[PDB]
Amino acid sequence: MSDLETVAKFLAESVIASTAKTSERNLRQLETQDGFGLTLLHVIASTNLPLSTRLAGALFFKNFIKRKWVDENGNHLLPANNVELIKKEIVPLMISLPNNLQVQIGEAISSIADSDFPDRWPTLLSDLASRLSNDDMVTNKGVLTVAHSIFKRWRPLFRSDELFLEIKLVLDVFTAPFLNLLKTVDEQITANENNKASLNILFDVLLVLIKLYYDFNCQDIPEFFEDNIQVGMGIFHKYLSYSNPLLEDPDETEHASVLIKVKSSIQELVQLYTTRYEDVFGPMINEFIQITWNLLTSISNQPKYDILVSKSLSFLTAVTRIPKYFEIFNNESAMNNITEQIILPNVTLREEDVELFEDDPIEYIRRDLEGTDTRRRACTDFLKELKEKNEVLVTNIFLAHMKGFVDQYMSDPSKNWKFKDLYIYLFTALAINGNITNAGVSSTNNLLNVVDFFTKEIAPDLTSNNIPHIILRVDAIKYIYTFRNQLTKAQLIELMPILATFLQTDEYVVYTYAAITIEKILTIRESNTSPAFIFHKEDISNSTEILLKNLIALILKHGSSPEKLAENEFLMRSIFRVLQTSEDSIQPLFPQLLAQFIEIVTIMAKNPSNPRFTHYTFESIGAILNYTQRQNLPLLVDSMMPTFLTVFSEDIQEFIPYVFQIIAFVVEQSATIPESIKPLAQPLLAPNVWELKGNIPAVTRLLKSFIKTDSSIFPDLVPVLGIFQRLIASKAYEVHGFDLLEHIMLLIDMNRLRPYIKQIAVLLLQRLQNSKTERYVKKLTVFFGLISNKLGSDFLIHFIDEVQDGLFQQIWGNFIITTLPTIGNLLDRKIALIGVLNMVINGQFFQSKYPTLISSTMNSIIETASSIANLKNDYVEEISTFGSHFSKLVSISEKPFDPLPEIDVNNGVRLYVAEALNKYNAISGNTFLNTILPQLTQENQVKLNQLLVG
């Protein structure tokens, strides 16, 4: 009967599946009653209700605050009376609840504070701080957790006066109790040395105190913490070394405990102090170094210490970057003791990796290729940081240890094979200056010889009949991959038949890394200033067929199920690269290769699984078509189109944007539309083809290719204009609409366009009033320039005026000349600028009909021609839905249409404009410049003289 009893009833029902949704609808109805907020608080406090019902009430109250406490402007939405009573009850209520309920009320307080603190809740800070006591560490944890939730909001903020005022307010209340409480927790931890339960509680409080210590120091080191630094950091200094058998258990290797987290939080704070407040922290840094050195010395290799180890190494890395503190271990003794104690024990190959090698080879390869927070990586980055500060010392110290690793291996290669993996790894890390990139390694350590190390240590392991462990075979191949830029062409050529032979083995990682290394060798450029690759077609032609034959056999090796066939994308990436390098070397085999790729497409269509495999399959098809003689395209086309039609009819959306690109390329390269492709033209225009974002770029390209190659394939232009309308009306697809329109206007005879030219202009300009974007107006301006440059100034005027006489001059003076100087894309800027100039110097009708437009047009021209790289350079988060992704095929990519190729966008534009203006002035009997100069702004009269006298 009661309203409290009724609220509790449906709070309870909300935990049960059959009533989860109805209970919420009932509660939302009960929620309209005034005081529902306070009714929830009374339910939460009712110890006679089951805990789950009270928890449902605490969660509902919390989310009630988040929904209905304030509107977007910060106006309280509850009656002013309820608001103040909530703020008065909530803190005392929080204290009285057990943990599971207490934390949710703490979060509701934090949510209220998000909007009301500090201006509209002045009592909160005193309210919270007054609940801390020396004898109740449970209540302390709860209160401190609320404080941390509020104060940690400072961490992502930019400094400001308003923020520092807020921080000052908090410090005045908390500094004394915070330090005192911190000074009390350390005392009770020692007194309770053998009380497990009380220890876990005390360290829970310590963890939040450490996090709060960070909150108070994340913007600047406040005066209080500078003055009291010795006691504060002194305490943390202590617990970095603390060890208690009760708070540990060797039987757990993954789950980091509160003690582990406390030391990690301490190391976070120590690195903050070391990197931001070294001036204040300096005197104490040496103590933390020594304790960090001892901490890493006696740390178990169990993963549960991984984070602590990396946070310690990042601290030591920050210390390595401070010269004063790097010198304490910038000598052979210390550097050698770091090596033996810190780095080497963590760089050895751990068997948690060897198992990934055997059980999930493809994943091992992907992670090896791209790489964090493993001890190996954390320690190797530390090793790099040291090398950067003293290369000679670090290198020689490791060359000494590696010398002994060689002897350990040569003595018993079968058992000590892991030692050879070690010094290959170490040698690589020491030899590379910085990190390897997608382009390889660009420079190496002058104290090491990668070619010598290759000849002596790597090459023998490639061809040795027996290998102590296939991991060393992989290490050898990976060395070639890593140092490919450091080997000569002749050395690489000698390796090509060896790597190719690996493609006939059964070891997953060996033949995959071999394929990867071949592919990367074929991507090495001769230099960055020309496109030529080191490997030309004559360097691969004699092995192209056998490489492709073996790569295909590896793809098919484990069965032709869609998921297994497509498993290894590196095989198909290598096929693509081989094809690209070989060009027309094996043209006679193109029909058979293409038939094999088409069969792969057919199998994968049952379940597309690997998008990278799929992508490079179609890249490979694109490469074949790119190197096929044009008169042989129809025969290849005919062998593909049955499968492509099935891709449409079965709606295999993963392949549809690739098929559209391939077909478009074929049409672009043919003098006529192949007969098997003609039936697609008019179905292409159905609106349902243009619904998915992932297909639009591809079907736009296909439609453009039909228009260019043979626009008579479209007997009716109405549905073509219907596509243009659909694209141009859309903010998302407007760019494709302009791209289509350019093809329409420039490539279809005007006799055909005549009945539609007014409608085209109306559609194009409707966006200006309804829903114009900045990109739209920029693209419209470029489009005007393109029309002017090609069809002429008179055409453009009568194209726009056909919509409404007078519209040309209105759009020109409002949109075109105002927008021209803001166009940042360099090719678009040239087209627009030259097109606008063309109106003045090659538009006698423009001059005679709109004489008063010339001055403002010239101001825009001069400003645009006399101006920057600061402008937005391109025309570039959201929910992915099925089919929303488009992937461009580089094998058949097209460069943008430049109608003004004799004018480089870099410096030719400015020179062109100046020469065109001088010429026009000369043709005018030297009256244009003199007549227009006084009509320009002061600023542009100067810029113009710099152009002409330039």
Partner: protein, 466 residues
Amino acid sequence: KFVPEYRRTNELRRRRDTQQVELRKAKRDEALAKRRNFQELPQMTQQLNSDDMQEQLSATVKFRQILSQRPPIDVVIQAGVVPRLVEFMRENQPEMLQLEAAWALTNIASGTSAQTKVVVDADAVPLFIQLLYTGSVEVKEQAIWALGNVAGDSTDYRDYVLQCNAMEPILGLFNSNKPSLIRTATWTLSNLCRGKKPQPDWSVVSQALPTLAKLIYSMDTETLVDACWAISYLSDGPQEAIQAVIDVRIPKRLVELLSHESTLVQTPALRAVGNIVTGNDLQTQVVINAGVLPALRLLLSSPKENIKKEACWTISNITAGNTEQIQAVIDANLIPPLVKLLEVAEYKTKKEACWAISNASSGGLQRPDIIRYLVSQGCIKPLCDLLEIADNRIIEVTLDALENILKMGEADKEARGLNINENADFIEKAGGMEKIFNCQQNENDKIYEKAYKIIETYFGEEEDAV
């Protein structure tokens, strides 16, 4: 969801103190405001009230002596002699009596604010000012010292002194030959110029700039210290205040003083020069033409950390200027030292070298050879390293530098037909790609969005090499 605006996240030139609120412990590099000029009380009070001139003098001399070199200020006040001392400064009193009375009052005003209040409420200030007109050189020296302590006590007494028209007679003192008079008057003058909120009446204290232009041509260290501090206060202002300093042709000698032997001189001189380059490009070029860039190069190696910091801040407001001014910085060989500080200096200094390099890269978008040279000098690695430790504002500034560097590399790739963006490869080589990528974990949305754009624009598996 509503939050206070300063808890939301959704011209490169920087003025002295755009944000005054501080959490850090205040560290004073400024000269102490007040200065002191190094029981038979009943009997002295009887002589001071006596009608005899020689009895008055002997009493005044005694009160001055006990107040010299600690001094029982509150005890002298309790004797009720302060108004009598003030009477001894009146225009119709003997010269030596005026001298002693003014000296004694100077030291009473040298103590607490309550003790200064005693002298001020006794109407001493109009008489000090008068003694600056009528006194001998010895009298003028005592009166100007007294006015320094009043002015140095608070902005209110500073303004009261100025409201009494003290500036006109004070500015007449600087024709004296006595180095001790010039020293004291320069310190008092710096006290009249000191104080930010409220600032002194500009129409009055800007009348001192011609005199300050002369004073910085002193070779007395103490005089130069307080003269440069005075100029540093007056130059802390908008373009109008900077222009008044330029008009009196102070910058040339101010720049010369950056190379003074004493860091007590370099500090205020550098502060004043820093203030001047917060205006516009034209005002900044006046300082460049005075030779500030070679002088700044040496200060980047100064043993005083705060000198290095202020030198970087000054350079950063120069590289906030135009292409030619950025090139001038490069031409003065200032980048190698900046890059060095960017990797080894204390954070507050390192942070300022970041602003300087970042601002230069913003103008380097118009002269790509600027960014080439920056990259050539190895700035990429220090910038990337700074991403891991810096406050959120400096993260944003550092990402903007890296974005400019990437834009230039991309524009260069397209202009020259290069295969890859060379600066993107340098950044990845230096380990910077991962450190930019990790900025996407920041809850600050501006930082996240910038890092995301950089990663997706320049490192997003763009293309297969063809």
